[PDB]
Amino acid sequence: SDESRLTRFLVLGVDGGTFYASAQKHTVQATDFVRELVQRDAALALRVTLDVVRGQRAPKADPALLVLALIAKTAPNAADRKAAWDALPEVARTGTMLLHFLAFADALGGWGRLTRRGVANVYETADVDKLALWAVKYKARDGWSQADALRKAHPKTDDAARNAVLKFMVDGVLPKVDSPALRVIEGHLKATEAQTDAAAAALMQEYRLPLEAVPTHVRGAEVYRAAMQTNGLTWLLRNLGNLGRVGVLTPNDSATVQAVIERLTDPAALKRGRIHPLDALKARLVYAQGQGVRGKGTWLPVPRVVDALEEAFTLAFGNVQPANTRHLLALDVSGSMTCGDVAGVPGLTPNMAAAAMSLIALRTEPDALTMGFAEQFRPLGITPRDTLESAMQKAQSVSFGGTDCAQPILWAAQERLDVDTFVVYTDNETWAGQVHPTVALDQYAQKMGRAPKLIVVGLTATEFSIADPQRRDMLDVVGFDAAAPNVMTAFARGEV
Ligand SMILES: [Ca+2]
Numbered sequence: 001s002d003e004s005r006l007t008r009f010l011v012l013g014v015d016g017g018t019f020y021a022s023a024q025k026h027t028v029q030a031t032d033f034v035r036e037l038v039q040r041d042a043a044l045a046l047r048v049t050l051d052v053v054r055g056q057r058a059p060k061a062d063p064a065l066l067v068l069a070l071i072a073k074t075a076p077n078a079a080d081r082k083a084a085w086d087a088l089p090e091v092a093r094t095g096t097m098l099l100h101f102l103a104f105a106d107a108l109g110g111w112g113r114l115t116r117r118g119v120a121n122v123y124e125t126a127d128v129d130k131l132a133l134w135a136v137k138y139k140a141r142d143g144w145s146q147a148d149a150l151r152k153a154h155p156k157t158d159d160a161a162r163n164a165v166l167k168f169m170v171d172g173v174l175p176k177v178d179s180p181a182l183r184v185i186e187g188h189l190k191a192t193e194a195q196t197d198a199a200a201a202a203l204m205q206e207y208r209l210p211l212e213a214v215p216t217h218v219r220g221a222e223v224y225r226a227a228m229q230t231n232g233l234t235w236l237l238r239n240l241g242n243l244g245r246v247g248v249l250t251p252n253d254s255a256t257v258q259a260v261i262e263r264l265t266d267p268a269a270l271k272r273g274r275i276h277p278l279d280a281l282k283a284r285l286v287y288a289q290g291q292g293v294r295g296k297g298t299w300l301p302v303p304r305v306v307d308a309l310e311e312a313f314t315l316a317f318g319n320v321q322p323a324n325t326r327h328l329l330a331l332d333v334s335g336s337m338t339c340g341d342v343a344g345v346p347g348l349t350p351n352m353a354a355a356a357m358s359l360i361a362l363r364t365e366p367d368a369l370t371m372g373f374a375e376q377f378r379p380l381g382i383t384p385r386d387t388l389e390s391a392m393q394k395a396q397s398v399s400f401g402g403t404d405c406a407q408p409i410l411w412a413a414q415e416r417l418d419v420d421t422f423v424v425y426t427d428n429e430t431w432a433g434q435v436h437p438t439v440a441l442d443q444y445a446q447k448m449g450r451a452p453k454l455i456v457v458g459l460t461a462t463e464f465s466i467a468d469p470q471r472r473d474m475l476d477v478v479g480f481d482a483a484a485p486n487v488m489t490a491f492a493r494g495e496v
Pocket residue numbers: 334335336337429
């Protein structure tokens with residue numbers, strides 16, 4: 001079905017059953033099916049695309065932006081090209097997304113009337129606050145800048161304030177209406193000219209300015225101190241190291257320490273911020289290193305903060321959106337599972353990641369059973385009562401067998417176990433058995449009267465292929481990242 005095949009491309013960013021959960025290239029490129037579909041039925045291409053954007057299941061806007069460009073620029077009909085343009089303001093939510101859309105479109109046609117108007121409509125529809133934000137935060141994206149687009153599109157609004165910010169976005173010259181939209185602009189201007197951690201701090205204090213506005217050279221204690229009070233939990237999670245470094249968060253400075261602990265374990269803030277347990281696990285591991293990636297400095301991890309992150313992990317389970325399907329999780333339990341940094345997270349071993357995901361399933365899905373490719377294929381005996389640490393150990397066995405992704409499915413049919421979703425967790429070592437998982441899945445359907453799905457996760461994989469591109473019941477997840485769990489859940493629910 002065109003609808004289903006296009007939706008899959010829109011979510012995964014590929015025209016097959018593979019999610020590159022990444023930190024690699026895999027930039028979305030339009031395949032033949034996608035172009036052919038846009039010519040054949042641009043109207044449904046567009047309806048499908050809006051459905052996906054609104055449904056918000058796509059980890060990335062990229063594929064929807066590309067598809068939208070294709071329709072807008074190359075759809076045979078004028079009503080379709082026009083409808084695509086009319087949707088641009090919705091789909092290109094941020095300044096970056098608009099510049100990204102233009103990078104896709106510029107390879108499909110020049111600046112005809114539809115294009116000038118369509119781009120102009122984006123700026124003319126945005127309020128003075130969104131415009132000001134774009135003016136300071138989304139100035140450029142590689143080749144394309146807001147200035148470029150504005151010179152080609154020439155937007156004009158009814159109100160002088162917005163025209164003033166549009167003018168500023170082109171010529172960088174500061175006016176002075178006010179609408180405190182200019183305020184944030186003036187603030188960002190002065191911020192670039194700081195030289196001192198204190199003036200910078202005093203500046204975002206005066207001007208409600210983001211930590212972004214502060215030159216890397218001057219972001220000291222007062223700058224980070226200031227940033228905390230003005231950001232949510234997600235920010236806080238990825239900034240613990242930056243706080244240990246700039247001398248704000250230290251083992252002998254209890255007031256800030258307690259205040260961080262309270263935010264990290266605030267159930268209401270966890271829920272509203274939609275913190276996934278892996279988000280908390282990543283923050284803990286990153287923070288506990290006391291040293292960052294290239295060119296970062298060091299810091300002294302505060303133990304009780306590390307502790308609070310362990311609590312945030314447990315509390316976050318309550319906010320996971322379940323597939324609501326019966327899962328059988330088959331874990332690779334061999335020694336190499338203890339090696340590697342999944343998703344570039346220092347210390348996040350495939351074994352740790354798989355144990356975390358097992359606990360999640362056990363605690364949130366209608367049913368879940370965990371098996372392992374051990375001496376023989378057997379239950380690991382992990383339960384919702386386990387900790388991350390005890391589950392990790394149950395998922396390690398000195399004697400192991402090949403990681404055969406067909407085998408959990410063959411086993412379940414043999415045991416007449418009702419399973420909706422099979423999930424295999426490995427590092428990068430799928431091993432082919434005598435029966436392919438496709439045959440396995442067919443045999444299960446034939447014996448049990450239901451067609452289940454299979455997800456194979458290569459937690460540190462760069463490339464493998466198990467999922468049949470011609471089937472819909474299979475998904476390969478290559479690598480891992482923060483978007484992977486939601487994609488897997490969406491897939492299991494039949495939405496991908
Ligand atoms: Ca292995």
